[PDB]
Design a protein around this ligand. Structure first.
Ligand SMILES: Cc1nn(-c2cccc3cc(Cc4cccc(C(F)(F)F)c4)sc23)c(CO)c1C(=O)NCCO
Ligand SMILES: Cc1cc2nc3c(=O)[nH]c(=O)nc-3n(C[C@H](O)[C@H](O)[C@H](O)COP(=O)(O)O)c2cc1C
Ligand SMILES: CCCCCCCC/C=C\CCCCCCCC(=O)OC[C@H](O)CO
Ligand SMILES: CCCCCCCC/C=C\CCCCCCCC(=O)OC[C@H](O)CO
Ligand SMILES: CCCCCCCC/C=C\CCCCCCCC(=O)OC[C@H](O)CO
Ligand SMILES: CCCCCCCC/C=C\CCCCCCCC(=O)OC[C@H](O)CO
Ligand SMILES: CCCCCCCC/C=C\CCCCCCCC(=O)OC[C@H](O)CO
Ligand SMILES: CCCCCCCC/C=C\CCCCCCCC(=O)OC[C@H](O)CO
Ligand SMILES: CCCCCCCC/C=C\CCCCCCCC(=O)OC[C@H](O)CO
Ligand SMILES: CCCCCCCC/C=C\CCCCCCCC(=O)OC[C@H](O)CO
Ligand SMILES: CCCCCCCC/C=C\CCCCCCCC(=O)OC[C@H](O)CO
Ligand SMILES: CCCCCCCC/C=C\CCCCCCCC(=O)OC[C@H](O)CO
Ligand SMILES: CCCCCCCC/C=C\CCCCCCCC(=O)OC[C@H](O)CO
Length: 441
């Protein structure tokens, strides 16, 4: 009774009464990050209006909740171990804890596989996508991900063996519960191999697709200019995109009608200077376009904004703030922070050309964020999967590796939110405007 085993990170011992304190603390500090990051993504998506890619946001929000639940699920037994151990074998507790974490990691994994297929359909069949990827079908997909995730780890309760190392924070799970080559083989067949195959196969086809060989894409530039500064900025941006192979249609706001103005454009750049003696006022030719902006076809449009102003005014390039706020509220995708020119734009020509270089990545930006999140997710999990396969097969047994690969796999519940939050301009625009109101209180 009360035999001792050395801790995985090399210092101390654990038993039915002794706890590895250093190992418990580094788990607790990671759960704090997972909880904070996922609550921030959930808050900003809902409270700040985050309306572009409504459909794909079903999977991103399901992942943020599954990741919040990983953080809390891990914080509860680790805090409880820091306070005391029961002095007995926690057979059911570690079995139940290990099941929950496995189910939640499966949910995130199947959400990324569905995001890759969602993007494959939006790219190859944008009109079919609009009319056939509906909220009802998105809810059925998420219900099936939860049920299927619960079903594949169900055998861990019926004598098939240990489904992972997550519960090895409990002495009985680490020493007395064994993995099985047959159960690991089952998990790899029903979860790891199929989910990884869907993402790899799907992103392989996404990265091969070319719909336009005559042009990169077609961009509309609409500008409001009273003394010619925003016109010059517009003309400099138009020539940078034309040289890069875009079909560029640049039009003075004075000469345009709002009705269906953005229809047929992959990218729309709205240029407007700020005027008004006393208030913030949009350049005169732009006011009628702003007033009728709900008629332009802005919902799901990729838009970026530019304008000239002067920072002695309290609303520096306020026309740009006002146009971005309305486009966000109309469910446009702000693909890039606005270009806000102080003074003569001829003296800021490098800032203009650099901005125009960045917008060249705007049409593929959202897809590339979802690709980076998918690839970081699988890379952080790969050491765990390799350890699982080799230890289930009895090629090696290394508690230090078991510990480090499991910590790193839990850490993808913090990387998903941090990458998404920092890579979306609409989100960082939702994050800052919500946080400016939460900075006062
Ligand atoms: C603390 C501790 N670690 N351990 C381990 C020893 C050897 C290997 C591993 C692998 C682990 C997998 C893991 C790694 C990181 C985050 C997670 C998480 F899912 F929980 F979050 C899980 S824990 C652990 C013990 C022994 O049981 C103890 C302890 O104190 N025991 C005595 C009271 O039961
Ligand atoms: C009457 C007046 C009001 C202005 N108000 C603002 C303002 O509120 N905010 C700002 O950033 N700049 C303001 N400006 C500076 C202009 O926006 C800046 O000169 C800009 O280059 C004009 O560009 P445009 O030639 O494209 O219209 C104002 C200028 C004038 C003459
Ligand atoms: C890697 C960096 C430092 C190694 C960890 C530092 C070692 C800290 C020892 C605390 C510990 O792991 O366990 C304490 C407990 O009393 C056990 O019975
Ligand atoms: C590559 C992606 C990985 C994901 C990103 C995660 C960021 C990691 C940050 C903090 C985790 C905790 C770090 C552990 C080191 C601090 C050790 C410590 O402070 O423990 C002292 C304790 O008192 C001894 O008893
Ligand atoms: C979908 C796969 C669902 C499989 C879920 C398997 C349930 C548990 C089970 O089948 O275990 C019985 C075992 O054969 C002896 O007790
Ligand atoms: C979900 C919980 C399922 C409980 C089923 C169970 O624990 O059954 C054990 C049985 O002894 C194994 O053959
Ligand atoms: C199944 C094994 C899954 C393991 C990893 C998935 C690799 C399969 C893959 O990448 O397939 C691409 C497709 O064949 C287009 O070339
Ligand atoms: C020890 C085994 C190491 C296994 C190495 C895992 C490599 C991952 C893989 O299967 O490659 C497919 C490729 O990523 C598709 O794009
Ligand atoms: C072949 C040559 C190499 C060139 C670079 C290809 C790069 C990325 C994949 C292509 C993504 C293409 C952009 C699709 C944008 C789109 O129209 O779909 C709307 C949605 O926002 C987005 O998924
Ligand atoms: C056995 C299956 C092991 C799962 C490991 C596959 C990791 C992988 O292939 O990466 C995913 C994707 O390619 C990222 O873009
Ligand atoms: C520790 C080893 C974990 C490996 C962490 C890899 C991070 C990574 O995948 O970065 C590449 C890029 O950002 C994604 O396409
Ligand atoms: C038992 C434990 C053994 C496991 C220990 C080994 C570490 C494995 C983890 C990551 C390797 C990958 C590290 C480098 C990440 C870059 C790969 C990548 O992301 O490639 C796609 C790229 O975007 C264009 O093709
Ligand atoms: C987790 C698998 C390793 C991923 C690839 C290394 C990435 C290199 C970057 C940082 C080093 C972070 C610490 C590396 C973990 C130490 C590995 C370890 O402790 O295993 C060997 C040990 O000396 C006998 O058990």
């Amino acid at each position: 009774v009360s035999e001792r085993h050395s801790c995985p990170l090399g210092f101390g011992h654990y038993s039915v009464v002794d706890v590895c304190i250093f190992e418990t603390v580094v788990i607790v500090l990671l759960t704090f990050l997972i909880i904070a990051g996922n609550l921030t993504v959930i808050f900003v998506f809902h409270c700040a209006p985050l309306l572009h890619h409504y459909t794909t946001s079903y999977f991103i929000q399901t992942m943020a909740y599954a990741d919040l639940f990983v953080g809390v699920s891990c914080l509860v037994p680790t805090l409880s171990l820091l306070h005391y151990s029961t002095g007995v074998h926690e057979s059911l507790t570690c079995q139940v804890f290990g099941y929950i974490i496995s189910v939640l990691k499966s949910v995130s994994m199947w959400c990324l596989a569905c995001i890759s297929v969602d993007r494959y359909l939006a790219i190859t069949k944008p009109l079919s996508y609009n009319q056939l990827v509906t909220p009802c079908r998105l809810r059925i997909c998420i219900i099936l991900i939860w049920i299927y995730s619960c079903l594949i780890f169900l055998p861990s309760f019926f004598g098939w063996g240990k489904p992972g190392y997550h519960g090895d924070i409990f002495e009985w799970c680490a020493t007395s519960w064994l993995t099985s080559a047959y159960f690991t083989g089952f998990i790899v067949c029903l979860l790891y191999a199929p989910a990884a195959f869907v993402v790899c196969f799907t992103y392989f086809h996404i990265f091969k697709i070319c719909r336009q060989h005559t042009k990169e894409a077609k961009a509309l530039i609409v500008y409001g200019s009273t003394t010619g500064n925003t016109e010059y900025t517009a003309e400099t941006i138009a020539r940078e995109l034309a040289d890069a192979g875009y079909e560029v249609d640049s039009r003075d706001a004075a000469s345009v009608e709002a009705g269906g103005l953005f229809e047929g454009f992959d990218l729309v750049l709205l240029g407007c200077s700020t005027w008004g003696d006393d208030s913030i006022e949009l350049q005169d030719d732009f006011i009628p376009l702003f007033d009728s902006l709900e008629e332009t076809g802005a919902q799901g449009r990729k838009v970026a904004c530019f304008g000239c102003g002067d920072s002695s005014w309290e609303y520096f390039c306020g026309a740009v703030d006002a146009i971005e706020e309305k486009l966000k509220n109309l469910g446009a995708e702000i693909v890039q922070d606005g270009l806000r020119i102080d003074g003569d734009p001829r003296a800021a020509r490098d800032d203009i050309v650099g901005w125009a270089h960045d917008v060249r990545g705007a049409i593929r930006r959202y897809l590339m964020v979802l690709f980076r999140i998918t690839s970081v997710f699988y890379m952080l999990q790969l050491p765990y999967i390799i350890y699982f396969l080799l230890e289930s097969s009895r090629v090696l047994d290394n508690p230090t590796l078991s510990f480090l690969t499991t910590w790193l796999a839990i850490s993808n519940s913090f990387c998903n939110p941090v990458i998404y939050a920092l890579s979306d301009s609409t989100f960082r625009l939702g994050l800052r405007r919500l946080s400016e109101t939460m900075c006062t209180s």
